[PDB]
Amino acid sequence: VAKLVFFAGAAIIGLM
Amino acid sequence: VAKLVFFAGAAIIGLM
Amino acid sequence: VAKLVFFAGAAIIGLM
Amino acid sequence: VAKLVFFAGAAIIGLM
Amino acid sequence: VAKLVFFAGAAIIGLM
Amino acid sequence: VAKLVFFAGAAIIGLM
Numbered sequence: 639v640a641k642l643v644f645f646a647g648a649a650i651i652g653l654m
Numbered sequence: 655v656a657k658l659v660f661f662a663g664a665a666i667i668g669l670m
Numbered sequence: 671v672a673k674l675v676f677f678a679g680a681a682i683i684g685l686m
Numbered sequence: 687v688a689k690l691v692f693f694a695g696a697a698i699i700g701l702m
Numbered sequence: 703v704a705k706l707v708f709f710a711g712a713a714i715i716g717l718m
Numbered sequence: 719v720a721k722l723v724f725f726a727g728a729a730i731i732g733l734m
Contacts, residue, residue: 640709641709642708645672645673645674651668652660653666656693658693660721660722661721661722678704678706681699682701683697683700684692684697684699689723689724690724708732713733714724715729716730716731
């Protein structure tokens, strides 16, 4: 998103 | 998987 | 915290 | 531990 | 940066 | 490296 963002809320989803 | 494993190969998928 | 947040400041503490 | 290792199994604990 | 921040944009660079 | 590997040993360097 820059940074690597770890979305949570289950697998963690890392996206730039 | 314990540890948090970041699968890659695209979003990164973090799973225990 | 959502996202996985890596608190630092020593071990890193990852919390949602 | 080198690498940053994310221990899981609850907070994740990142240690070298 | 506190937290461990993963700078992206290539290697990811993790800095406090 | 697949997985996202956080090399340490200073900035952390995340590489696939």
